[PDB]
Amino acid sequence: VLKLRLARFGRTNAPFYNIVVAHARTARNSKPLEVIGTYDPVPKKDTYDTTGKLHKDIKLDVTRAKYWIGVGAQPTDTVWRLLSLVGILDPKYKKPQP
């Protein structure tokens, strides 16, 4: 089963992720089939922006990710939430309004 998931890298208290295409039953950090992108969870801040707004840097090869979702790849919950923001899949969870 191919999966679009994250490979935890970095150092202690400095997480960094690789968006990868790997078989489900393999080691988390083993060499995958492809590296589709990267994901940094800690939000950053523009250098000369004093407004206080934060952002998150995410590099993603949308063209390569769409092909794997088209052939039957199963993204994890975290990668699903990311792919839903860019506008590829529908969200799995939503804030209840009532």
Partner RNA sequence: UCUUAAUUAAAAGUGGUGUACAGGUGAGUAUAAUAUUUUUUCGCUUAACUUAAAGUGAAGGCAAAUCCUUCAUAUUGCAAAAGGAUAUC
Whether 6 and 39 have beta carbons less than 8 Å apart is answered as yes
Site string for RNA, 18-47 (x = CB under 7 A): -------xxx-xx-----------------
Q: How would you class 19 by CB atoms within 10 Å of its CB: exposed for 0-12, middle for 13-18, buried for 19 or more?
A: buried
Residues 6 or more apart whose Cβ sits within 8 Å of residue 92: 77, 80, 81, 84
Of 13-21, 36-44, 72-80, 90-98, the segment contacting RNA by CB under 7 A is: 72-80
Asked if 52 interacts with RNA (CB under 7 A), we say no
- Count of residues in contact with RNA, rule CB under 7 A: 11
Q: Is 74 in the site for RNA (CB under 7 A)?
A: yes
